[PDB]
Structure formats: C-alpha cells, structure tokens
Curated annotation (Swiss-Prot), chains A, B:
One of its GO terms (cellular component) is endosome membrane. Changing residue 6 to A: Impaired potassium channel activity. Changing residue 211 to A: Does not affect selectivity. It is a multi-pass membrane protein. It comes from Homo sapiens. This is Endosomal/lysosomal proton channel TMEM175. Residues 66-71, 126-149, 269-274, 333-352 are cytoplasmic. Keywords: Endosome, Hydrogen ion transport, Ion channel, Ion transport, Lysosome, Membrane, Neurodegeneration, Parkinson disease, Parkinsonism, Phosphoprotein, Potassium, Potassium channel, Potassium transport, Transmembrane, Transmembrane helix, Transport. Residues 32-36 are annotated as: Short helix H2-1.
Length: 412, 412
C-alpha cells in the first residue's frame, strides 16, 4: 500500500494538459467569411473537447475517491488510463471533421470504451484487495453491492458508446444520440475532492497564462539574417517590430494570474466542494482558456475604429464570462455556507465583504468597459487599457479600498 | 495569513512549463551538416535554459522556505516574480543568438535583476511582518542578521548581472564571465523541500509525456480535401500514412510514464531530499526532456541500416542518461539512509532489493540494447522494439521476478 496523493497530482497535471490541448489551434489561427467560420469551428471544438476531458477527469476523481490507497499495479493501471484519456481530443476532432465517416465515430467510441475498461480493471483489482479501498467501503458489509454499483457506473459509458459504434454502420444519428446520452445520463439522472479541483484548476491556469510566451519563444526570436537585411542590423528595431506580441503576453498573463488569485482566495475558505461548484468551476476554466485569443486580438490593434471596438467588446465579454462563474461559485457556496464555507466568509463574517469584492472586481470592470464601449465609444479603447492598469492596483489596495468604502457607508 | 501550499504548487507548474519551453524547437526540427549544426545548437540552448530555469526555481523554493506563510500581497509579489522568470528562456536565446550585440546580454541581465529585485521585495515584506516567517526565523533573536543574510543571497545574482550589463558596452567576455560566476558562486562556495521537488518533477514528466500528442492533435488530423484527392477518399489510408507519429507518441509516453513511475516509487521512501539529490534529479529531468526526440528519430525509421543503427544507439543513450541519474539519486541516498530514506529501503530492508531492481531496470535494458547494437547489429533494431515491450511487462511482474531471483540465489 502507498499514499495516492502524488499519483493523483500527476493525473491532474496530465488531464489539464489534455483538456487545454485544443486551444492551440485557436491561438495559432492568423486573423473573410471563411476565416470567421474556421475560427468559430475551432472554438467550438475546443469547448467540446474541454468539456469531454473534464467529464473524464471527474469520473477519474470519483473512481479514486472510491479507491482510498494506491499500489504499484494500480499506479500502472492509472498510467494506462491516462494514456487512453490522452486520445479523446484527437478522436473527437477526427469525428467532427468527418461526421459521416463511421471510422471517426468508431475511433472515438473505442477510446471511450478503453477508458471505461481500464477503470473497470482498476475497480476489480481494488475490490479484490479490500485494503486498497477507502475505510468507508472497507468497513461496509455490502462490499459486493458497492462493487456492483461502482462497476456499473464505470461501464455505463462504454456500453452506450459500443451501441453507438455498432449503429454507425446502420443509422449514424442514433449513434450521435447515444454519445450525447453518455454525458446526459450522469447529470440528468455529491461532493468532489477539493484537492483534485484545485490541482486541475492550477494546471489549467498555468497553461493558459504561458500559452503566448510559449508561442513567442519559438516564433519571435529575431533571425540574424533578417535583422541584417530588413532592419539594417538594428536588433532594437527588429525587437520593436514584435512589440504587440509581448504586449499581448503581458496582458494575458496578468489577467489569468489575477483570475487565479481570485480563485485561490475563494478556495482558501472552502470547506467542501459540491457538484454545482464543480460544474461552475469547469465553466469558468473553459472560458478562461479563451483569454489569450482576446488579448492577441486586442494587441493586433487594426487601426479601424469599428474593428478595434469589436475587439474590445469581445475581450471584455470573455473576461466577464471567465469571472462571472467564479462569482457564481461563491454565490452558490453562500447558499450552504454552514457546510461549504469557513466561518470567516459567512454572511456577516470578518472577511465576507473582502471576498465579495475580490470576486466581483473583474466582472464589474469588464461590464464597465463593455458599457463604455457603447456610451464612450471614442475613449473606450483607452478605457480598456486603463482597465488593465486599474484592476491589478485594485487587487493590491483591495483591503484599503474595502475599508474606505465601509467607513464611507458608516456615515452615509 | 494563509497556507502557502497551493501558491507554491502553482509556482511549480509555471516553472516546469517555463523550463521545458525550449524543447519545442528541438522536437519541431524536421530531420546535411547545416541541419545537424542547427539541431546541436537547439539541444544546447534547451539544456542551458532548463538549467537556468531550474536554478531560478531552486532559489524560489528556498526563498519560500524562509517565508513560512503567505498573504495577498505576497501572492501578488509571487505572481510578479513568476512573470519575470517566464522571460529567462527568451532572453537567453536572444543573447546566445546575438552574442556580440550588447542588447541581448543587457536584456538577460535585466531579467535576472528583475527576478532578484522582486524576491528582495518579498523578503523585505515578509521580514516587516514577522508572522509570515517560518517559526525558526520568528523565534530567533537574530532576525536582523537573518534578514541581512537572506537579502544578500537574493541580491547576489542581480549585482553580478548588473556589472555584466555595464561591462557589455566595454568588454563583453568579462560580462559573460560574470554571468557564469552568478551560477558558479552558490554551488562552488542543505535540504530541499521534497514537496517542491516532487511537484516540479511531476510537471516536467507530464509535459514531456504529452509533447508528441500535442503535436499530433494540431498537425495530424486529416484534411477532407487531402483525403479525397490523395487517398481516394479512404480515411483509413490517410490515417495509416501518419502511423509513425502515433508509434512515436506511444513509445515516448510509455517510457516517460515508466520513468515517472520509478521516480514516484523512489520518492515514496525518501524522508528528506538533500542538495546532491536535487542536482541529480535536475540532471535526470534535463535528459528526460529529450526522449520525444529519440522516439521521433526511431519511428521515422529511414530504411538505411546504418542510419537506423545510429538512431537506436542515440535513443538507448538518451534513455540510459535519463535513468542512470535516478539510480544515482538512490545510491546517493543510500550513503545517508539513516536520515534520507525510510527504514523499509535501508540496506537489508524489506523492500531494498525491490527498489534497487525498479531503479536499475531501465539503465540495464538501455545498456543491453546499446551493446546488442554493436554485437547483434542486424537484430539490434528489433531488439530495441523488444525492449519497448519487455520493460513495461518487467515493471508489472517486478515483484514476481525479484522473488524468483531471490529463490534462485537461495540455492545458488
Ligand atoms: C469490441 C471492443 C473493441 C470494444 C467493446 C468491448 C465490449 C465487448 C464491452 C464494452 C462494455 C461492455 C458492457 C458493459 C456492461 C454491460 C452490462 C451487463 O448487464 C451486460 C453486459 C454489458 C452490456 C457489457 C457487454 C460487453 C461490452 C459491450
Ligand atoms: C538600473 C536597473 C534597470 C537595474 C539595476 C538595478 C541596480 C540599481 C541594483 C540591482 C542590485 C543592486 C545591488 C544589490 C546589492 C548591493 C550590495 C551592497 O553592499 C551595495 C549595493 C549593491 C551593490 C546594490 C546596488 C544597486 C543594484 C546594483
Ligand atoms: C458484464 C461485464 C462484461 C464485461 C466486463 C469486462 C470486460 C472486459 C474487461 F477487460 C473488463 C471487464 C470488467 O472488469 C472486471 C469485471 C469484474 C471483475 C471481477 C468480478 C467481480 O467479482 O465483481 C474484474 C474485472 C465486465 C462486466
Ligand atoms: C544595498 C541595497 C540596494 C538596493 C536595494 C533594493 C533596491 C531596489 C528595490 F526595488 C529593492 C531593494 C531591496 O528591497 C528591500 C530592501 C530592504 C528593505 C527594508 C530594509 C531592511 O529593514 O532590511 C525592503 C526592501 C536593497 C539593498
Ligand atoms: K497539485
Ligand atoms: K499542472
Ligand atoms: K503544460
Ligand atoms: K505547448
Ligand atoms: K503539486
Ligand atoms: K504541473
Ligand atoms: K508548420
């Protein structure tokens, strides 16, 4: 027997990488109807693959909530499970790119079946050696019924996908219906490990923050030949020619880091994460993945006022979507504060107002910039930049600002 | 005050991404002297940037060993520190690509100075609020001397790099000498947080395992137009045309996952990690980063026997270098087992032989394949594939094999 914490941390790292894999085609899209259609398709594929990989990650998290402690064989089986999961984005992209070809849907169904079969092997091994189970399962007298329930839950998806794979040769629409039913059944018809949620969130945030510097380190180191021919041997000029990329990276890193800061602060006060909090966290991460695209678009900065106005609106919308779901997590937690939140941030608690301000800082700023874009259109672009400067400072001075507001309302 | 564990986990994730960033140019190198020179330059740059980012990560780890507990201001300062660190690979690549241009060396020195200045701000803030310090520092009466020592250690590198930046305008070789002195002084003239080492290692392993699938998901989804024109509308043929990439990914993921399995097993029994163990871990990770290149080269599989023999030798050498340093970590730990290892894996312990076999499995296999390449040249290539099949199975049956060997030696 061994402690399973590090194995699950490795699983979370791999799964965050796999979930965010499909954001690279979006950010590498150079950017007339054809280009817009291509970008929309890529964004939709990214969202769907992120959600699918998140569903797989959640299934893994609760599977290894059932399995309390790990073992060499369990570690190798988990490696096999991760290997199978790493193919979901590619097979899904292949299926959507070739909807009418049965081979793509068959490959996706095979990937899902393989994940389920490896997880069923893990469940069988763990139940054959009860000391690997959680104490709740170990001490229960209905271990056989627990095994049946867990194994049925694990193998539900594989059965539906196997039926879909069969039907692909006869009636494709029913195959797609079964694939969607796979995701529908678990949620249309419990707590989630807070550590797993935190690890997955940290991985996603770390990847999204550094996407643009990863692009820069590969593409934007000047070529000495190009420097000597096109910039008259001036390295400073060659580096200035690529300024917009650096500005995009700075903005994206700052925004993603501050959103992670808000998430970190929120989860420092969470006692237990519910399923609703997990769903809202998934939505927030999915929309967070899109910030690099927003900042690329705004940094490119086509001089046309209408184009730049559209870019600012899109960026503000993306930031609002990223942060409103964190605020929604916090509001959902407040409904069951007694069991979900530490007493510090309960209604009327010491740090309740500070947490509220910290989580509402970004949605308010994004909404204000978006409104300025409609009311103060000419200044709006500058206002957007002002936002990028104001929000970080507000985070530094947040306690002083909250105290000032409290003192002001004391008399008012 | 807040718990600093999640902030440091996020730092480890970001730092692993930044350390492994420069491996992408290596794996994206399509592969006459010019190509070899380009590949050698890219590999050297990757190694140097990995080592530099690891030095920065180690400095960060011990800085936040000094700082016991975190705070909102400390969290934001840490975000700024990570932002500064993310520019080390790009500035180093720019400096090496333009060695004679003072601007590149100046930018690298500025990045180093900025990292040091942010860390000095963190130290000053933590010491101005002693409750953020570790209890050892808090209870000491020499907190002023501790502050002086820590601040000097933090600002050592910035001073040397500032001198180098000045000298770049007058005598460049002395500037380079000072830059190397920055790294020389700390090591030429203590324990390391095992959690930080584990998190960094897991991040690096997770990135390296999935490099090739990240490439595949972007580049190798067939284009319907290409499928219809070049493969006569056969999607299976189009997918078979890209088989070697999938084989390379399978091999690379299996090898990296099993090396991580060996690392995980080793560190499950480590009580405290010393500086020597940290250095050996860094070397092992640096050489692990090169496995995707080895497997790409072997999967490309030019039919020429000499070329394939060279590619098998290179792959075996890379695997041996990756795993021998894990074995060296284990051997170094055995020298101070009493304080470094759990009693289970001490000399003559219950699991000592199993740990030895687990860590020596890969070096022995790689050395045997390399030797077969010289003695059994014609079969060697097949033997390499045999290795890819044998080592995983040996990991599954490792306990049975160890028991069999013990029983055999009982009579012999
Ligand atoms: C053929 C390979 C490539 C992939 C598909 C594997 C097949 C044989 C597996 C995957 C999941 C399995 C199913 C999982 C659960 C159940 C429910 C049980 O009450 C009857 C058997 C049934 C319906 C299984 C039959 C076999 C099954 C469909
Ligand atoms: C100019 C900007 C862009 C970058 C460089 C910042 C300069 C001013 C900073 C960076 C590190 C600093 C040094 C850090 C440590 C010491 C040792 C002390 O006994 C004398 C001052 C001295 C030598 C500092 C002088 C100022 C310094 C060199
Ligand atoms: C109905 C059905 C059909 C097929 C499969 C199946 C098939 C292939 C496969 F690889 C794994 C599985 C499932 O994996 C196990 C299931 C049970 C057991 C032990 C039994 C116990 O005591 O509960 C061990 C492993 C399962 C159930
Ligand atoms: C000799 C020298 C020269 C320059 C700098 C410097 C310069 C710029 C900068 F941003 C930060 C620093 C260093 O950051 C601090 C140092 C001390 C203090 C408080 C003093 C205490 O009580 O020890 C707080 C912050 C430091 C030492
Ligand atoms: K973690
Ligand atoms: K991670
Ligand atoms: K990553
Ligand atoms: K990448
Ligand atoms: K971790
Ligand atoms: K990581
Ligand atoms: K290309």
């Amino acid at each position: 027997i061994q402690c399973s914490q590090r194995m699950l941390s490795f699983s979370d790292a791999l799964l965050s990488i796999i979930a965010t894999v499909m954001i690279l085609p979006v950010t590498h899209t150079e950017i007339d109807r054809s280009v817009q259609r291509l970008l929309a398709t890529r964004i939709a594929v990214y969202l769907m693959t992120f959600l699918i990989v998140t569903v797989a990650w959640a299934a893994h998290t609760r599977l290894f909530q059932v399995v309390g402690k790990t073992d060499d064989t369990l570690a190798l089986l988990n490696l096999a499970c991760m290997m199978t999961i790493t193919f979901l984005p590619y097979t899904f992209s292949l299926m959507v790119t070739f909807p009418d070809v049965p081979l793509g849907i068959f490959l996706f169904c095979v990937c899902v079946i393989a994940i389920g079969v490896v997880q069923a092997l893990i469940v069988g091994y763990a139940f054959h050696f009860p000391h690997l189970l959680s104490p709740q399962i170990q001490r229960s007298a209905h271990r056989a019924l627990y095994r049946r329930h867990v194994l049925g839950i694990v193998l539900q998806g594989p059965a539906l996908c196997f039926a879909a794979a069969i039907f692909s040769l006869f009636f494709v629409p029913l195959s797609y219906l079964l694939m969607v039913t796979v995701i529908l059944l678990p949620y249309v018809s419990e707590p989630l490990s807070k550590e797993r949620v935190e690890a997955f969130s940290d991985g996603v945030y770390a990847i999204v923050a550094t996407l643009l510097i990863l692009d820069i380190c590969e593409d934007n180191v000047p070529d000495p030949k190009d420097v000597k021919e096109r910039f008259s041997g001036s390295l400073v000029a060659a580096l200035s020619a690529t300024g917009p990329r650096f500005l995009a990276y700075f903005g994206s890193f700052a925004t993603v880091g501050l959103l992670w800061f808000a998430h970190h602060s929120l989860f420092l006060h969470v006692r237990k994460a519910t399923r609703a909090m997990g769903l809202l966290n998934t939505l927030s991460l999915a929309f967070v993945g899109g910030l690099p695209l927003a900042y690329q678009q705004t940094s490119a900065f086509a001089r046309q006022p209408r184009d730049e106005l559209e870019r600012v609106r899109v960026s503000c919308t993306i930031i609002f979507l990223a942060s409103i779901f964190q605020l929604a997590m916090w509001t959902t937690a407040l409904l069951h504060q007694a069991e979900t939140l530490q007493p510090s941030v309960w209604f009327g608690g010491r740090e309740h107002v500070l947490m509220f301000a910290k989580l509402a800082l970004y949605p308010c700023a994004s909404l204000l910039a978006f409104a300025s874009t409609c009311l103060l259109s000419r200044f709006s672009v500058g206002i957007f930049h002002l936002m990028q400067i104001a929000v970080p400072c507000a985070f530094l001075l947040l306690r002083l600002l909250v105290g000032l507001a409290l003192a002001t309302l004391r008399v008012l």
